[PDB]
């Protein structure tokens, strides 16, 4: 079917490269490390989503004047003024930031939050991109053994 659709558009022939994995057994030694657990990986990403949601609701209820990704100044948008928008911002930026979420938001120099938000950001770092990607990597490393 994909080969026939390749005539209607000469790009469905890219879907035929999936046969190097779902077909011949020259890649089973590598792909078995991923497909061995599978359920563990999807439960890990589910737990990651839940932890990010908890961090999101905490930031939504206690951190207002920080999510201010303004461009050129005096253009506030992409804030945390919405639960779904804040959750998407978290799941899309804070996970891939490589340094937690404290490098993507304003400096927490204001009073009454100098310590609370430092704790928040360091806990996000140590729990999301330190011991929750270590789990994903350990699930791949243990399958080889």
């Amino acid at each position: 079917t994909m080969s026939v659709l390749g005539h209607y558009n000469n790009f469905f022939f890219a879907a035929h490269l999936l046969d190097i994995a779902m077909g011949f057994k020259t890649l089973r030694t590598i792909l078995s490390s991923v497909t061995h657990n599978g359920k563990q990986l999807v439960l890990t990403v589910g737990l990651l989503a839940v932890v990010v949601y908890l961090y999101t609701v905490v930031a939504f209820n206690f951190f207002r004047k920080f999510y201010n990704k303004s461009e050129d100044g005096d253009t506030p948008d992409m804030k945390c003024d919405d639960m779904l928008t804040c959750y998407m911002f978290h799941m899309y930026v804070g996970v891939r930031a490589g340094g937690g979420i404290g490098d993507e938001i304003e400096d927490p120099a204001g009073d009454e939050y100098e310590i609370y938000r430092i704790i928040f950001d360091i806990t996000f770092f140590f729990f999301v991109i330190v011991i929750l990607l270590a789990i994903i990597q350990g699930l791949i490393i243990d399958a080889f053994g």
Binding site: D111, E112, E114, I115
Partner: peptide, 20 residues
């Protein structure tokens, strides 16, 4: 104001160990 007072209030409890 709790960024600087926190550590001082935390150390204020160990006076009971310093006295003994």
């Amino acid at each position: 104001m709790t960024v600087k007072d926190m550590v001082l209030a935390f150390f204020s409890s160990y006076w009971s160990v310093f006295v003994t």
